[PDB]
């Protein structure tokens, strides 16, 4: 029973790797040899956001590149303004342990997650003037890890029990459930078209999920350790992944294998969060040895080094116009770099 | 630019109100001392503290508030989570201490408890956190030694060659055999904790019972030890 199944599975994975090795005509770095290098990129701390009490676990920009949500472990969710350093909202959370936060594309809602496996949506209309819990979602068994808004009606969440859901906010139930992963799903990265997404789990395998169909299309097994954060390329045809083995990797949805690997011998620390830039030439990586590396996505060389944090860079975001890059670390400071 | 001056005055007023609220919350946050309660499923870790003021239950976690000598304590019991714990433990680096509760009465589980204590102790983010150790169900160890065969000497060949430490003081009304077993468990955990030798955090061993009141005062005293050792480190005295 189990041995003919596992032998069939192994012959299928040998067919898949024969496919993947036939497809590999050449490498990206050979192609990109006659490409002008980026050079030294110097970015400076334009603003420093303060007033958080505990460590800043996750944060997410707005779609107008103006207001950022920051999420902390003290039980406070602070909606900031990036231009004038004004706290436009501060929300007290029910559970103190928070692991993710999401901001709606229209700006009407903020979502937060954490260890109490409940996604809490807060409305920002404030017809009375006070922020209130708009809804709570308690479907998942394991902890809630990263959650992102497709729109104001449907939110996609990544639990800790290897299951991703698609919630409808109006019904308050789970529309579509994704259960293909075996390791703990850490974060998800939505497509710019919002038809697909990718999830990186702890089993060193990124999956490509269709929201409407309800099943994975592709599996990527290029890493060696826990895939921490995942981010799409701005055209929606590629993604980058950061793991604990100090190697970033770039993957293709069409070639179904890794194009390039971003690795340096001097740094052996893990990779917390990666965001591309607007153009897609700079890959920004929040390393665990207290700084950010600006890798070149086409040349695999560090442009420059954002060593402004005192503790580990917990999360990294880039605005939709590419104007500034915000990093939150575990010293409770949010640096805006330009 | 008059309208933008009006908008900036309104945003500044909102920012002043929020900033004041955050200062009050900063005071309340700093007064609070966090404690992570970790233990295996065999052990009665819930039965450890009986001086709890309240026992509030969230969906996937349990929170306990108690105060000792006007000092507020939050104790977070991890509830319904997956068996793999290497990703949600990173949240708990900010706590003052980790209370670790182990059942001595069953012997097979003890080896797993020793591996879990090793993995706690050698973790990168749990280096700054002290760990406070409870060796629960000592009365059961007493009752279970008089069973014709010793399990611990089977599961551990070192315990055929072991003597009671001279620094250790046995309680009156006890069997030297039972105290040998107690201190040999204690020594296993202290050899795991001394093996690393970082000097940033220490391991406080305590022999507790099934029904006992003194546990909150013990955790208070070990908190005083942790913050005194932390300030001694901080002025580079030790």
């Amino acid at each position, epitope marked *: 029973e189990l041995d003919q199944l596992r032998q069939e599975a192994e012959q299928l994975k040998n067919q898949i790797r024969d496919a993947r090795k036939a497809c590999a005509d050449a490498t990206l770095s050979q192609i990109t040899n006659n490409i002008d290098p980026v050079g030294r990129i110097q970015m400076r701390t334009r603003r420093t956001l303060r007033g958080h009490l505990a460590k800043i676990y996750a944060m997410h920009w707005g779609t107008d590149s103006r207001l950022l949500v920051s999420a902390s472990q003290d039980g406070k969710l602070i909606i900031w303004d990036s231009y004038t350093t004004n706290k436009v909202h501060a929300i007290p959370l029910r559970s103190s342990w928070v692991m993710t936060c999401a901001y709606a594309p229209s700006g009407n809602y903020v979502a937060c997650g954490g260890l109490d496996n409940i996604c809490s949506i807060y409305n920002l209309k404030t017809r009375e003037g006070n922020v209130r819990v708009s809804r709570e979602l308690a479907g998942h068994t394991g902890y809630l890890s990263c959650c992102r808004f497709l729109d104001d009606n449907q939110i996609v969440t990544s639990s800790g029990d290897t299951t991703c859901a698609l919630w409808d906010i109006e019904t308050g139930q789970q529309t579509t459930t994704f259960t293909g992963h075996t390791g703990d799903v850490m974060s998800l990265s939505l497509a710019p078209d919002t038809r697909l997404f990718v999830s990186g789990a702890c089993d060193a395998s990124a999956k490509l999920w269709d929201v409407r169909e309800g099943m994975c299309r592709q599996t990527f097994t290029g890493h060696e350790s*826990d895939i921490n954060a995942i981010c799409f390329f701005p055209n929606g045809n590629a993604f980058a992944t950061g793991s604990d083995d100090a190697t970033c990797r770039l993957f293709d949805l069409r070639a179904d294998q890794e194009l390039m690997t971003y690795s340096h011998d001097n740094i052996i620390c893990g990779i917390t969060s990666v965001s591309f830039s607007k153009s897609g030439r700079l890959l920004l990586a929040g390393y665990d040895d207290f700084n950010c590396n600006v890798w070149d996505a086409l040349k695999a060389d560090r442009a420059g080094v954002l060593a402004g944090h005192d503790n580990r860079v917990s999360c990294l975001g880039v605005t939709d116009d590419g104007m500034a890059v915000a990093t939150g670390s575990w010293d409770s400071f949010l640096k805006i770099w330009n | 630019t008059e309208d933008q001056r009006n908008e900036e005055k309104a945003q500044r007023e909102a920012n002043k109100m929020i900033e004041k609220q955050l200062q009050k919350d900063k005071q309340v946050y700093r007064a609070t001392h966090r404690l992570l309660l970790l233990g295996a499923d065999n052990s009665g870790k819930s039965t450890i503290v009986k001086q709890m003021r309240i026992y509030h239950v969230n969906s996937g976690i349990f929170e306990t508030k108690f105060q000792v000598d006007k000092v507020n304590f939050h104790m977070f019991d991890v509830g319904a989570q997956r068996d793999e714990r290497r990703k949600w433990i990173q949240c708990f680096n900010d706590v003052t201490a980790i209370i670790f509760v182990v059942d001595s009465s069953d012997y097979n589980r003890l080896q797993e408890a020793l591996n879990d204590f090793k993995s706690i102790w050698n973790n990168r983010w749990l280096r700054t956190i002290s760990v406070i150790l409870f060796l629960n169900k000592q009365d059961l160890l007493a009752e279970k030694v008089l069973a014709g065969k010793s399990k611990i000497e089977d599961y551990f060949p070192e315990f055929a060659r072991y003597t009671t430490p001279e620094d250790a003081t046995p309680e009156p009304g006890e069997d030297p055999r039972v105290t040998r077993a107690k201190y040999f468990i204690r020594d296993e955990f202290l050899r795991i904790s001394t093996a690393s030798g970082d000097g940033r955090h220490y391991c406080y061993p305590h022999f507790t019972c099934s029904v006992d009141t003194e546990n909150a005062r013990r955790i208070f005293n070990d908190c005083r030890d942790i913050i005194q050792r932390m300030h001694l480190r901080q002025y580079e005295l030790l």
Partner: nanobody
Amino acid sequence: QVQLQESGGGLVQPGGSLRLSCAASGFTFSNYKMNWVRQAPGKGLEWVSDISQSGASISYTGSVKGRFTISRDNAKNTLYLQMNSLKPEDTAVYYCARCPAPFTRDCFDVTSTTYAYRGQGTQVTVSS
């Protein structure tokens, strides 16, 4: 792709010898601490023994200590376990396990609910 392949095992006799070969494919072998983990019939997983990156530090489980040799070759990229003085009560499935992070000394791999850095394991039966 991280993949592990155990080899050797089977129906043996008490007091005999057996070598378990483990082949680690799909990663750099010298960076990771690695270890052996077994599963009795109708019981849970238990940590047999461990070995670090360089191979200097080696510890065992108490109740079978002094009975198993753990050799890692980095160049051959193989993990051997030498099993002499076998006992009929110690009949189980043996899984190679790998600690998930490189250059570290902390391991969380006793999980039974689909830990995905282990091999399929080998059945090792002792008949007296």
